[PDB]
Amino acid sequence: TLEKFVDALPIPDTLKPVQQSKEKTYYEVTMEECTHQLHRDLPPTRLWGYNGLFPGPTIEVKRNENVYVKWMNNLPSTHFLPIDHTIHEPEVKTVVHLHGGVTPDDSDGYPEAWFSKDFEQTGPYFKREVYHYPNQQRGAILWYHDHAMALTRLNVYAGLVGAYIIHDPKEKRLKLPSDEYDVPLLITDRTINEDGSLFYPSAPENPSPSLPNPSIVPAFCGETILVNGKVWPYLEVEPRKYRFRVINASNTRTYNLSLDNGGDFIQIGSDGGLLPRSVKLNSFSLAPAERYDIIIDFTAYEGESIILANSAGCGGDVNPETDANIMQFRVTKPLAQKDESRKPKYLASYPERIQNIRTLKLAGTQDEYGRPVLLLNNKRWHDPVTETPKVGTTEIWSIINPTRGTHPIHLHLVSFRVLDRRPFDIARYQESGELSYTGPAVPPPPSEKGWKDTIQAHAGEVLRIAATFGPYSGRYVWHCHILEHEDYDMMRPMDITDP
Template sequence: MMLTKFVDPLPLVETIQPVCLINNIPYYELSMKENSQKLHRDLPPAKIWGFNGHYPGPTFHVWRNQPVYVLWKNELPLKHFFPIDTTVHGASKNVPQVRTVVHLHGGVTPEGSDGYPEAWFTRGFEKIGIHFKHKVYFYPNQQPATTLWYHDHAIGITRLNNYAGLTGFYIIHDQNEKNLHLPSEPYDIPLLIQDRSINEDGSLYYPSQTTPPNETVNPSVVRVFFGDFILVNGKVWPFLEVEPRKYRFRILNGSNSRFFRLTLNNGDSFIQTGTDQGLLPTPIKVYSLLLAPAERADVIIDFTDQLNQTIIINNDAETPFPNGDKPNLETTCTVMQFRVNKPLLMKDQSQVPLQLALESIIKEEPQYKQRNLLLNMQTDPYKRPIHLLNNQKWSDPLTEIPKLGSTEVWNLINITEQSHPIHLHLVRFQLLDRQPFDVNIYKEKGKIVTTGAKRKADLNEQGRKDTVRANPGEITRIIVPFGPYTGLFVWHCHILEHEDYEMMRPYYVIS
């Protein structure tokens, strides 16, 4: 099926408003609902699951040090509309098909509000074990200005719930960011980029089998998923009409498995001002912007001298990344279009200052605990290859138990053939470096023999992060301050097909 590009305007996602104040704390309510939504002008409406019935969900705009309450409601049907593999951990036949728990990705939140994968809740008022219909979360918002996002995190079906549409932006503002005079609303626009496959009748397609099919398990979890169409804010290949001035775009790769390497077809650069956890130390000019699933980039595009031009964001990232196939030139190579055709409403007084973030660099010290953590593969009882963290499964005993207030260096040793975006809940870490090593020697002898020098983090990765690309055949080192809360959290690969099937582990911060 072919669809015409650039016929739908980019949806500008609405901002959610609090219902009321509780002890001077804003209180919000969101319901997860089934709805129908047109993904392209020439398609019938598709069934989606969305927050307040919208895909993407409404955007939160909150201020640093102003906490909020959020009541998440599950008002979804009792039966899933995507195939569920009941051999996957947490998704067995003895649990409800439709389960949800919301994670504020990148949020520094207490244990009870983090969205632990097993703390799911269902539709209806009945209590099932520790699980309830509704859950009120408390978000302190104590971190610096940044672009976060919220999404479903239910164990065993995260890939399906997110693919159905349960995703939205959560943006924290602060006075430092405001004082920088970066482009602001309406010239500050979040962009949720995802891939999807769509049936002829307009409905979303998600595979029930990998290729070749597994004869033992049907439906079966797939190793990775790559859709045929690129959507931005829920529309296939949209366009955005802009003024000849600077715009700020908060770009999120919300795909299940697809990496994006974004470029502008006129050869201009992105000016990157922020990453996952807020502003970079200084603006970085990048002509190619690589984003793994769950990574974010805060960028400025200057359209000042582009009046009457059209500019396309293209993608040339391999699937799987980095050793797979190039995107299709007719479809997944294209993301969206800008049309510089609107009159300048007022003089552009926004700035790109030379200095941005106020946070200091986290320095590595000899006393910091070092953890070597393997990213590897194994075969499951049905002879399917699965990805693991440190050769362990979700239900294995806890092994990562950092102390509150401690700082550790995690060495992610990737002996698989693809990059894994590793996400840690609770913390805001920093990428130290990457170093190649001999994978064959490691597999044979369990010994690390490096084959090159350490490479420092790219300039546009040198801010605080919560998700990092761990490349194949490399040791990726991150430095992690643990706090400010104790409790049970998780770390995992954010390729959702990997996360759902064992590439996720709990960790516990102790006092």
């Protein structure tokens, strides 16, 4: 397998605007097929990248910065990965979603607002070439990625992911590490052929002769882990505090991260911005689309090499020589100036009436070919909309998971608070539809006491979340963020209504 830790960690450059005034910022980003080497010892890999880069450029904005992005497709008219024509027109369709954006519905990247090459053909909900992001929200780590109907798992795996950071000037008072000591880490697992080409499966394990070819698969676990577009890279760091913006941009894989020297992470932020209080952690779970804003303090580790290790299995136990590793920190860079950054415990203050409660079951069916189809509340993507909360109101969603696995559930537009999780008897529930609890409520850990947009709904548990639906009304979605589930068919429209 590929030799670990021989490539330096790329730091994506920060995108420069086409035009900027004190009241509006305009960006243009083109999706291009490109070639990049993913490891020292590989030929360059064919990729699809925002501005021909993988990951895409990091976009940095301020809170309330009035931003417009013209996202353009300059990709070829055929895909290089296997398309299953049975799960749901040009073959290649794209649309960009700003994950976590508090975004008007026509700029949110609705899966059926897709466009082909040069906007030549467009989906039924296509309305505008230039997206508007008012950024009227808390400072946070966001990210952008492809969201095209039934192609998301392919377009993302091809390389269409990038970080988007919202900076709230008020948070400067905290003196958190910044500028060159504030580094995004976009983690993607991939399987790469000896010739450098990406591998994505064209059929699952099931040997049924019925299956289409290609056929969608239920989950993808990559052989190799990349960070910022390089396999098992190293980052040289000074002996001081750094801020890392940690993004799981993988299709299916969940990571459980630790430092191999026993050092701790200080978590300062979750998907929806800073936590109320920082949390000292020896390890944390990071499912697809979750973000952790962390400080690592290398001050006491001068000279050390420190592995960012993974203990979570994906289709089996981790292999210590491969997916047990993420990247390596080398604390060998000479300290360039005194570290004036801080790691305050007390970060933010967040103070309500519940207007409605909603019960949602994570369900399955089998399709005509015998393949598993994953569903939200036993409905299909194209069923009439059922999640129709009113604008300005707060609901509790009780998400019941009787399946055997965890699903990272994401709601667009909003962030929400976690109330509790509670285990239930699956068999009982499955025969009767009655909830019977096998233990007490588990209140959220400190990591989940702030604002989330993507949340792990564990097997055999009821997860309750509380969300206020706004500020905008219109047509959004919610879905599992395992992309293989999302595409078939664990995604539903969500209408925030306004009389």
